[PDB]
């Protein structure tokens, strides 16, 4: 009716295929991202579907560059296209200017790519017939604004957040975040915060074969926490939930 077109409206007034894409982020497993000014931590629910699954070479944590991290949630086939372009973008800036790209600037570049649907609209080279179905939580560190966390839509729009969760447990996670986030959370107090909120939206047991942690720090760069360290922290959650 109002989606047979390749870019069509909508008696509401906003594009229809894009709207479906935003309600297809929810299908993906929860991706949480908590930003403090002491670093940004990204946690993800990997999902284990079988014990025959090898899940420690599967993650939704991806390095864009040393000083920019990303967590992806939604349909992750779509994010394969976007992550390649992002990596190229970051490299281009250091080729052209010998300089580290801003977190904001990188997000904006990936937003430009996201609008490429239609097959008769605008002047640009169209190479999609439908919008991407994946939303990103681009974290990073630039020296001009410190630590930054952006939430990038498949729309091609972006908001800077201090904490945003997307995916299945988006609503129940974010309910907690509005009250529980403040600026005196340190990196390690953020780190245990991720695991507490992730436990509520975890549809399995909370463990390190269905959860993966990652930080982005200026000092050590983009480091993905090994499963040994991830497991350790998870056991330290269950102790502090028995300290209540």
């Amino acid at each position: 009716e109002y989606d047979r077109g390749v870019s069509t409206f909508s008696p509401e007034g906003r594009l229809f295929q894009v709207e479906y894409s935003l309600e297809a982020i929810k299908l993906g497993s929860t991706a949480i991202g908590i930003a403090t000014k002491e670093g940004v931590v990204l946690g993800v629910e990997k999902r284990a579907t079988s014990p025959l699954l090898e899940s420690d070479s599967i993650e939704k944590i991806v390095e864009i560059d040393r000083h920019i991290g990303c967590a992806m949630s939604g349909l992750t086939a779509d994010a394969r296209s976007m992550i390649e372009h992002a990596r190229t973008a970051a490299v281009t800036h250091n080729l052209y200017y010998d300089e580290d790209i801003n977190v904001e600037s990188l997000t904006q570049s990936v937003c430009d790519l996201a609008l490429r649907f239609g097959e008769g609209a605008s002047g640009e080279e169209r190479l999609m017939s439908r919008p991407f179905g994946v939303a990103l939580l681009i974290a990073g560190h630039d020296a001009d604004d410190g630590y930054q966390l952006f939430h990038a839509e498949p729309s091609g729009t972006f908001y800077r957040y201090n904490a945003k969760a997307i995916g299945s447990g988006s609503e129940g996670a974010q309910a907690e975040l509005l009250n529980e986030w403040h600026s005196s959370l340190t990196l390690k107090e953020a780190e245990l915060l991720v695991l507490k909120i992730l436990k509520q939206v975890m549809e399995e047991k909370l463990d390190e074969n269905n959860a993966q942690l990652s930080c982005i720090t200026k000092q050590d760069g983009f480091k993905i926490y090994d499963n040994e360290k991830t497991a350790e922290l998870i056991k330290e959650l269950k102790e502090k939930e028995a300290a209540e």
């Binding site: 052209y96 200017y97 010998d98 300089e99 790209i101 801003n102 904001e104 600037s105 904006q108 001009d144």
Partner: protein, 222 residues
């Protein structure tokens, strides 16, 4: 026959200080043995306390002022009010240079400004691409006349400490923004009597994070 390149001469001199930088050059523009202009800097402010001169041929050397000033604008737009650094400026230029290399530019390009530590930074480019940092660099048609004197007064090249007689080398002595005025004028004074592409005017542009100061001095008519 049509010949696709020429020259227009000029002589530039970019000096890095220890907290200031000075990119200067003559304001005389020529072609062969006609003085085109007695007054005409090629030493343009470009924004963001970077001063550029692409000196030599004037047709190319205005092409790089154009595209560079386009890049200043578009950097602020596409990096959302992130300022173009001295480092950033150097590499961008390289890309513009390198971009025509089979129909190459025929200028000697220089930028100057301060670095992020608040000391001078001077990068100087060959006509087709690469750059390396300097502390003194002459260029233009009279490069090799002003250059070996600037090395003897900044970097103390082929000088030794007195009464040691070459046992102890002569170390660096931290410079003054006034002090460097004296060096630049005495060199281009020599330059007017000993080269013929030099005269009419000299314009020194001094660059710091405290402003860009212009100074126009007249030179000798030949």
């Amino acid at each position: 026959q049509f010949n696709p390149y020429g020259d227009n001469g000029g002589t530039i001199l970019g000096i890095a200080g220890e907290d200031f930088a000075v990119l200067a050059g003559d304001t005389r523009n020529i072609t062969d043995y006609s003085i085109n202009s007695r007054y005409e800097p090629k030493v343009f402010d470009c924004g963001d306390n970077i001063v550029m001169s692409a000196n030599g041929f004037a047709a190319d050397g205005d092409a790089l002022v154009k595209r560079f000033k386009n890049s200043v604008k578009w950097y602020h737009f596409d990096h959302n009010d992130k300022k173009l650094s001295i480092n950033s400026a150097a590499r961008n230029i390289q890309h513009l240079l390198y971009g025509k290399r089979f129909f190459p530019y025929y200028v000697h390009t220089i930028i100057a400004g301060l670095d992020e530590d608040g000391k001078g930074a001077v990068y100087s480019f060959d006509p087709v691409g690469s750059y390396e940092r300097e502390q003194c660099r002459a260029g233009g048609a009279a490069a090799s006349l002003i250059m070996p004197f600037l090395d003897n007064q900044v970097n103390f090249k082929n000088q030794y400490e007195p009464g040691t007689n070459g046992k102890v080398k002569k170390p660096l002595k931290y410079l003054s923004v006034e002090e460097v005025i004296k060096l630049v004028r005495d060199s281009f004074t020599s330059a007017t009597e000993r080269h013929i592409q030099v005269g009419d005017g000299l314009e020194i542009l001094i660059v710091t994070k405290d402003g860009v100061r212009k100074e126009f001095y007249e030179l000798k008519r030949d």
